[PDB]
Design a protein around this ligand. Structure first.
Ligand SMILES: O=C(Nc1nccs1)[C@@H](c1cc(F)ccc1O)N1Cc2ccc(-c3ccc(N4CCNCC4)cc3)cc2C1=O
Ligand SMILES: O=C(Nc1nccs1)[C@@H](c1cc(F)ccc1O)N1Cc2ccc(-c3ccc(N4CCNCC4)cc3)cc2C1=O
Ligand SMILES: Nc1ncnc2c1ncn2[C@@H]1O[C@H](COP(=O)(O)OP(=O)(O)NP(=O)(O)O)[C@@H](O)[C@H]1O
Ligand SMILES: Nc1ncnc2c1ncn2[C@@H]1O[C@H](COP(=O)(O)OP(=O)(O)NP(=O)(O)O)[C@@H](O)[C@H]1O
Ligand SMILES: [Mg+2]
Ligand SMILES: [Mg+2]
Lengths: 296, 306
């Protein structure tokens, strides 16, 4: 961990503007960074954790924050900065589009097959990269994929296991034994893709979280999303095998979905898939030069 | 052609004037992509004069070249709207142009920053020369600050669009940038890579003076005569003779005798490795230079192209 990658912030160089949402461990705000000696106001996203901290407690956090500021992959968000006060604040890039879960709801049945497949590929590439860095996500879900542009999504909020519940995204072995590996991350990938293919349906909606390990024992799984051809649905089911080692690997999921992305209409069936927009190269260039210059 | 977005009037709005010059007014604005809920800040330039559709076809031909540049020290044109007065879209620079930046930080700019800026501007101009694009209007106001460590050339390439009227422009009519121009350009209204080198000389002079107006108090009417007599801009107090002589070389009468952008890169890169030897600045020992932690932060938040 090159410690120059994590910028330590004083309270005086940023301000919280507005609340974006909250989750298990914190609250996310629209923020503004003020570089010292300048008059510019730079938008940032700030997460403040619910529970306070001591310098001994902070030593564990800094040690991990250094690891998450060291990721370097186009499909993985990296921690940028931190402010250690009574409560801890974490700073990353603010994404105006927000998370992919809200984006598929906002455009429900208004999203073509080229986009959904492209996203699956991209989430897989980012998860594979974390695996190569030997980082377990532990909380992969559509709410933790961020839309940088409609053509470019990024994984966020990974790596919290060595500092510590999303039952309906969790593998059977994680529910029963708090076992988190990359293969249980592969389970949450399967659930994430099911979210995309349903435009943000809630998984196991009538079924309380208390009962989830029973129904997975019984062999029940999430139903096949209407737009999914069988080939796509069995990748999802392969991700939900009892035997973690029988699940697909993230390198395999990249090859597979990127093969389906080459003829998207063969693998998903969307009504008026020709009503749908598709990523114009003119549109893609404009988005990249304006808000997405990173190297890919 | 994919590199220039042809825009609809409905997908952007002007919000605030940022400034104006010879041919247009610049606004801070918002791009609102169709069918989305996001408002993306952008800079919008509206030209002062309305254009016919035939004039627009010419403008569009040049706009495609202006959108084709791809270099970390040259800004590219992003979109165009063919409104009655043409509107032009590029990235919005929160720090503004370098002229206003050096004026606002006149007491906190050290020799590393100034020399690095000279290198970067030379790099961008040499890319334009390699692409055989003439600037015609290089000046500190047409260098933008992406971050204090990363400056970029803007607003090049207009010469062909002005060719019909260029010879008629009055020295006092503010359409022809007399105090940045080579002598042969004032007399003949033709612009080349070597006359751009002269503007570069003036641009560097602006930076070394933290934004003084060149030939201040002298009407533009009289510039051609004082140059023909051998007069030039004075030596900025912070410049050693080494730096002043490069500047004076950019203002030699014979265009072919001036330095090349290729060589200016090398010379300013050499000085940038020992800045306090070549620029004498009050408080330079204390002046800020950016640690890797702060440059990394800057790049992730607003300058990912690196
Ligand atoms: O900051 C992050 N999100 C953001 N959203 C918006 C703006 S910043 C992501 C994040 C951002 C990235 F860019 C990349 C990875 C990543 O994980 N982090 C970083 C981080 C560091 C430490 C912790 C942390 C520390 C302690 C605890 N304990 C304390 C004791 N009681 C139980 C909980 C739990 C979590 C969480 C995160 C975290 O959630
Ligand atoms: O848009 C540009 N600046 C911007 N600032 C902020 C937002 S956009 C740059 C610009 C941006 C870049 F990124 C790269 C190069 C560049 O030149 N342009 C583009 C442009 C196109 C056309 C013209 C133009 C066309 C016609 C005339 N005639 C008409 C006949 N009667 C006399 C006047 C004058 C000027 C000017 C520019 C221009 O100034
Ligand atoms: N960098 C960001 N830019 C824009 N929105 C963000 C950003 N980070 C987080 N958010 C938004 O803030 C919401 C709350 O985030 P967070 O606190 O991580 O909870 P969560 O992901 O929804 N649930 P958990 O699983 O507990 O993280 C996210 O779901 C997004 O809606
Ligand atoms: N992309 C930008 N982002 C933020 N500010 C900009 C941007 N481009 C230009 N500006 C600012 O807008 C001002 C006016 O620009 P412009 O209309 O080109 O005139 P100019 O270059 O200053 N003079 P002239 O050389 O006569 O055109 C500039 O001087 C800068 O202060
Ligand atoms: Mg989250
Ligand atoms: Mg300009």
């Amino acid at each position: 961990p090159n410690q120059a990658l994590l910028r330590i912030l004083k309270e005086t160089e940023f301000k919280k503007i507005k609340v974006l949402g909250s989750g298990a461990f914190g609250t996310v705000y629209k923020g503004l960074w003020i570089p010292e000696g300048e008059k510019v106001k730079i938008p940032v996203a700030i997460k403040e954790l619910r529970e306070a901290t001591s310098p001994k407690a902070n030593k564990e956090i800094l040690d991990e924050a250094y690891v998450m500021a060291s990721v370097d992959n186009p499909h993985v968000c990296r921690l940028l900065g931190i402010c250690l006060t009574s409560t801890v604040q974490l700073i990353m890039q603010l994404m105006p589009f927000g998370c992919l879960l809200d984006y598929v709801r906002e455009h429900k049945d208004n999203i073509g097959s080229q986009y959904l497949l492209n996203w699956c590929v991209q989430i897989a590439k980012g998860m594979n990269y974390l695996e190569d860095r030997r980082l377990v996500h532990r909380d992969l879900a559509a709410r933790n994929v961020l839309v940088k542009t409609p053509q470019h999504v990024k994984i966020t909020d990974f790596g919290l296991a060595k500092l510590l519940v999303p039952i309906k995204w969790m593998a059977l072995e994680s529910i029963l034994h708090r076992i988190y590996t990359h293969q249980s991350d592969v389970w949450s990938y399967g659930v994430t893709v099911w979210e995309l293919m349903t435009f943000g349906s809630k998984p196991y909606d009538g079924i309380p979280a208390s009962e989830i390990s029973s129904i997975l024992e019984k062999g029940e799984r999430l139903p096949q999303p209407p737009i999914c051809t069988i080939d796509v649905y069995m990748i999802m089911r392969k991700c939900w095998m009892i035997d973690a080692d029988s699940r697909p690997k993230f390198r395999e999921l990249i090859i597979e979905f990127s093969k389906m992305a080459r003829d998207p209409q063969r693998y998903l069936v969307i009504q008026g898939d020709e009503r749908m927009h598709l990523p114009s190269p003119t549109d893609s260039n404009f988005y990249r030069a304006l808000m997405d210059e990173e190297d890919m």
